[PDB]
Target: Glycosyltransferase
Amino acid sequence: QLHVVFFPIMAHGHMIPTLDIARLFAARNVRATIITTPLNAHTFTKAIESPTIHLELFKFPAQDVGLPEGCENLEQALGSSLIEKFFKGVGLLREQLEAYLEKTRPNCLVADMFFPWATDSAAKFNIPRLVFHGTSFFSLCALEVVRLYEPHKNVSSDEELFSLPLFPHDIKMMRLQLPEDVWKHEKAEGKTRLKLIKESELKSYGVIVNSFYELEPNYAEFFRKELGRRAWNIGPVSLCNRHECLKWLNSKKKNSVIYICFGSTAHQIAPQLYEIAMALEASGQEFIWVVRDDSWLPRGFEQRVEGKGLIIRGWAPQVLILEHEAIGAFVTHCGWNSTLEGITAGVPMVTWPIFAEQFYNEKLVNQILKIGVPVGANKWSRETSIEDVIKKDAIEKALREIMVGDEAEERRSRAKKLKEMAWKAVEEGGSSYSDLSALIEELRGYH
Ligand SMILES: O=c1ccn([C@@H]2O[C@H](COP(=O)(O)OP(=O)(O)O[C@H]3O[C@H](CO)[C@@H](O)[C@H](O)[C@H]3F)[C@@H](O)[C@H]2O)c(=O)[nH]1
Ligand SMILES: [K+]
Model:
């Protein structure tokens, strides 16, 4: 039996899709083991609830890097200090990884993009290593093209626009949409980490990508041809698996409710929430709003919008909501897992990128896929300063445009097209089904 070990970084947005990939492999009679840490194991245990996914717990050296003992997850490492400590900590997992690989000798290692050294670690035992990023072909390409060509240095002001080189679409961006650790005050740590991450894509056996060919064929090709990567598109992997707010939505018109949610880990301050609430009231749209009370809500808000607006404070069933008939739009931060869920439900999106690769995802959604509307946020930042809050006016304009604005029904039509393409890609005979079959056969044949 083939054995593949999966090693995601301790972040919810990488762990859940990695589990789905493990399940996809398992359903093909492949032995799948996921490496995690003790305080993160509960995520996998809950989502396991079918072939057996095995877990292996590594000790996370929080004390050695000066982190609180309870900080085993990227989401809890808030601030440059804590984040650099977190990445030093995860780099220190290399010894446990090499011990586990020597002990078990699996046929393949699928390792998170944040572990470039994992390539060499697997090479010590002649094991091929695959990179998993968890984002779109487009972001992979655009990030690599920006790193290589640095078109942000041909610019005089923060909002001066430049095109992305080589791309078959003209994509205009400003250096505000890039991290200041690249264009303003160059800090060698992040630059080196990025260099090594992007290099691992060519030094390794190849890249697994959570996308489907028909979604972004130009960039599925660009990644392989112009950028030289060996890759397999096997997404959306969440389709492998396939209530109060639902009963609420049942009595609503089809495609009439806006869903607002900013991802698994939301760092969101009271002034921003207050602007969102005011914009929601002014827009008149029915809505489900997922929040992490007079400190951020207008007086009488929840009662003044009762029956029309619903605030969810806990973990929301995002997929069940998005695919309910009543939901017509999605205000999102453009994380790739949420973006892909919006696409798979066929739901247009208001794009509100914050950090990471989300501005590239926003360009993919708005300019290329033509299923979204920008809210107007254009400043890359880990934490939000009060000086950067998006005001209620832009939010209301975007909420209006996404529901009844120009092309809204066409966006719905395009998204339903993408929805059918997504479901077809993963069914037997589909592009993603076939690429997964091909990857597994190649792994069987290795040496
Ligand atoms: O109330 C809730 C709130 C969330 N969820 C689920 O959590 C997921 C949110 O994923 P999303 O990509 O938007 O945020 P996150 O995964 O942290 O993004 C990082 O990881 C991504 C993957 O690399 C990356 O693209 C991104 O830039 C990073 F920020 C998504 O699968 C939802 O279904 C829910 O079910 N109920
Ligand atoms: K090249």
The radius of gyration is 22 Å.
